[PDB]
Amino acid sequence: GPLIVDTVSAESLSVLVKVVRQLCEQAPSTSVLLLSPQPMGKVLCACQVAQGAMPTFTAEAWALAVCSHMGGKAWGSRVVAQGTGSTTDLEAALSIAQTYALSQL
Ligand SMILES: [Ca+2]
């Protein structure tokens, strides 16, 4: 299943979650994690795991892997999750997100 992992502009976590949901619905085999930088070094995270994915791949665990790296927190379910953190290293956050997904798919 395809994978979208990216850093994007968004005005709120609610918008970010809704964008993730629409991407997953428009291409239902896809799993998606978006990170959105915000002021003061904060970064928002929203993700969603495709319904067809391997059962060991859960959204909460994915978000936690990324947000814990960013000194933050995550919450959610096996299907959708969110979190926040702060970081100056978007490349590292993206790499954790992509490598985690590839290891669980
Ligand atoms: Ca499957």
CB 69 within 8 A of CB 33: no
CB 41 within 8 A of CB 14: no
Phi and psi for 74 in degrees, rounded to 5? -145, 160
Distance 27 CA to ligand 1 centre (A): 14
Distance 10 CA to ligand 1 centre (A): 31
Distance 65 CA to ligand 1 centre (A): 22
CB 55 within 8 A of CB 27: no
- Determined by X-ray
Distance 105 CA to ligand 1 centre (A): 9
Distance (Å, rounded) from C-alpha 11 to C-alpha 23?
17
